[PDB]
């Protein structure tokens, strides 16, 4: 989709299109900057978007080459 950003009284916000608005009225959200991206998330589900994203390669860390 495509939305806008905007300033309030010294606060930078995004305008949420009515289609993808958050279910329920609701309370507060979490946010994280990945890259030049921002993920928004309801409280208690911050890690979901990472578990359900792409996984690491089978070869990833077979070995953990620590010394002794």
């Amino acid at each position: 989709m495509h939305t806008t950003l905007f300033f309030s009284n010294r606060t930078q916000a995004v305008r949420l299109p009515k289609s993808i608005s958050f279910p329920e009225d609701v309370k507060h959200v979490e946010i994280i900057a990945v890259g030049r991206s921002r993920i928004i998330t309801p409280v208690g589900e911050s890690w979901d978007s990472w578990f359900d994203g792409e996984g690491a390669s089978t070869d990833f860390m077979s070995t953990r080459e620590q010394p002794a």
């Binding site: 911050s46 953990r64 620590q66």
Partner: protein, 132 residues
């Protein structure tokens, strides 16, 4: 208010298996979890040396992103140079990377969350938990 320093072993194990019992844990304890910057280097090493450095640096980088990465500071280097010596004064061996994570959590009051418990017991004054 952080409580939990995830070790490299947990990190690695979660990256490979993305288990469900970890995923509920990670959701409850979201704003109390970190890793030492010592771990991060390992994660980084492991991705670069892997057969998919771009794919695995992204997965790390979203894994990194959702927690706090603590700098191995002075208080951490004093506390591991003390935990490392009295470890020799008793002859039990633990890895140069594993001493630093144990010590860094030790230097700040955090409990190490590991799945190599047996190798973390012999470490003086440590607190330990397993989430796998």
């Amino acid at each position: 208010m952080l409580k939990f320093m995830l070790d490299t072993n947990t990190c690695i194990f979660t990256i490979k298996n993305k288990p469900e019992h970890i995923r509920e844990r990670f959701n409850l304890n979201t704003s109390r979890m970190c890793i030492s910057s010592i771990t991060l280097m390992e994660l980084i090493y492991g991705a670069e040396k892997s057969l998919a450095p771009e794919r695995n640096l992204a997965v790390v980088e979203g894994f990194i992103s959702r927690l706090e990465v603590l700098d191995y500071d002075t208080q951490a280097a004093i506390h591991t140079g003390q935990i490392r010596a009295e470890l020799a004064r008793k002859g039990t061996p633990v890895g140069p990377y594993d001493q630093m994570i144990a010590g860094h959590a030790g230097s700040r009051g955090l409990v190490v969350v590991t799945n190599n418990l047996r190798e973390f017991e012999r470490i003086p004054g440590i607190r330990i938990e397993d989430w796998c």
